[PDB]
Ligand SMILES: CCCCCCCC/C=C\CCCCCCCC(=O)O
């Protein structure tokens with residue numbers, strides 16, 4: 001089960017890569033080229049790292065617990081690009097952008113330590129720290145980021161509502177899966193944990209990628225010159 | 227002794243984080259927001275990494291020598307932000323900024339190798355290389371950086387004198403502690419080495435943070451419009 | 453043989469560092485300062501990492517195969533700076549610059565995995581992936597990069613022809629050496645593999661550095677105001 005869902009990961013991310021790549025190549029102006037290029041690299045990075053997992057790499061048995069540590073290398077590289085999707089579309093100020101990228105990096109880094117810690121009590125301390133880093137990003141997104149975006153696009157409030165709704169719901173699912181998996185309560189087997197992360201990853205990357213494109217189109221039409 | 231001084235580290239950096247965070251949240255313009263945000267992240271990074279050390283992590287016994295390698299992860303991330311404090315306040319040109327960040331990264335990277343090298347002769351070669359990287363930064367700071375800062379703020383020469391004096395004195399203490407510790411002559415026990423680094427870290431982060439804020443206020447008042 | 457050619461590496465990169473450093477110090481304007489500083493850091497990074505290799509570091513025996521993994525740390529840091537040489541001189545757009553840096557990072561990262569993989573079949577999968585990342589960069593360079601450069605300097609088409617010719621020929625030699633070495637067919641001994649990489653590295657860093665300087669002079673004279 002694990003094996004097939006890793007390969008579905010490779011196929012999904014590779015298909016996302018190709019179509020974002022073709023978009024980037026054909027891009028009508030620099031704004032569209034940039035957005036297509038961010039999403040291409042999110043999906044390209046995820047493809048290669050899913051290939052490593054499918055080939056049996058990036059995994060260690062830590063005190064008897066099978067642990068896919070390469071997964072956090074993927075997240076550390078792809079999640080800031082997903083935040084750049086948001087800050088690009090929102091035309092976010094540098095301090096709030098920096099704060100979002102900082103908190104997110106902190107979330108993933110503490111997430112990594114929470115995972116690879118042999119002492120699972122220490123791991124679970126880091127989980128809580130990581131959740132607080134996520135909460136920091138949630139606060140920044142629904143406050144400073146949203147208000148800046150709404151100020152920049154007064155007629156497109158709903159666009160950023162949809163973007164933030166999808167981001168916040170999908171990203172909250174990750175720490176829930178982490179709790180269900182061998183990292184936490186171990187309520188689901190490795191096959192199921194792998195399926196959950198793969199579906200999450202394809203949705204949060206290819207799914208959110210296409211939503212980011214659709215959102216750019218709506219903003220472009222909404223701000224079209226008379 | 228080691229244990230308590232690691233926890234004093236956590237408390238100090240966490241208190242620095244909170245007050246810089248509150249400053250950032252309340253920041254009167256983008257210049258103040260940026261400065262508060264840089265210092266928040268210096269102290270936030272240091273908090274989490276001091277928590278890892280206090281919890282017993284980030285440490286290895288290398289050929290019988292207890293070695294806290296995570297300490298250099300902290301320095302590699304926080305020291306460029308401290309340099310950004312200087313280059314932000316000094317409105318430093320991109321090449322000199324880049325040169326400062328480059329030399330500093332080189333210092334910490336060679337510092338790391340100097341530490342984790344099992345062969346202590348090779349370690350001590352890397353110490354000397356790291357000292358020369360520091361000397362490079364000293365030269366850049368007291369020459370190009372200072373002259374640019376003085377050119378930018380002709381009436382605030384003393385501000386940058388105070389900033390550079392505190393930076394140069396505090397940062398020179400680090401390689402001295404390194405020589406006194408198990409990395410060098412082992413003239414002080416692990417408890418004392420830990421106390422020294424903690425006091426240095428709180429001073430160079432929270433201390434220098436507040437000096438950076440005070441300096442910004444002086445520059446803002448000095449350049450206030452008639 | 454290996455040992456001497458590592459030390460020739462240290463001497464070559466150190467000599468390149470000094471002369472680029474002296475250029476940077478004496479630089480006539482910010483454009484020359486930036487170009488000199490990029491090339492200084494390419495050569496400075498390479499010096500320190502060649503010193504580590506010469507001192508016997510950064511090497512592991514992976515399932516009986518001696519493997520110099522620190523070599524890919526050098527390439528991961530120095531190769532984007534070499535790309536920055538090109539994008540600086542070409543005044544390349546941000547998306548194409550980003551695409552070049554992204555593909556190059558991907559090439560070196562997959563190159564690294566291709567090397568350290570104990571399973572050499574998996575290694576050779578990663579080699580092919582890495583070659584496709586290189587091909588991506590080749591496409592970007594000879595298309596978008598070249599056309600932007602030619603648009604920016606209509607009278608200096610030959611300058612960028614020379615830059616791209618040297619880049620493409622030299623960089624293609626790396627995957628050939630990789631195939632000849634213990635990573636591939638093992639058709640050459642470790643002494644010869646080391647000599648090849650050292651000569652390549654000095655040429656692609658000091659050699660290309662001086663070509664980048666010469667190219668800047670030609671562009672400056674070609675665009676000199678009447
Ligand atoms: C802006 C970038 C954010 C940086 C994250 C800072 C948070 C620090 C978190 C933990 C660092 C400790 C990691 C080293 C110990 C884990 C290894 C182990 O236990 O084997």
Ligand SMILES: CCCCCCCC/C=C\CCCCCCCC(=O)O
Nearest residue numbers: 331332335339497500501504509510
């Ligand atoms: C601009 C970034 C600066 C990069 C720093 C370059 C200096 C290179 C220093 C040393 C690299 C060697 C590290 C690998 C060997 C150490 C590991 C070991 O001995 O076990």
Ligand SMILES: CCCCCCCC/C=C\CCCCCCCC(=O)O
Nearest residue numbers: 045048049052057058557558561565
């Ligand atoms: C823009 C940055 C590019 C990032 C590169 C992405 C490609 C991913 C490649 C492979 C990741 C797998 C590495 C971990 C497994 C190797 C370690 C081992 O086998 O012992």
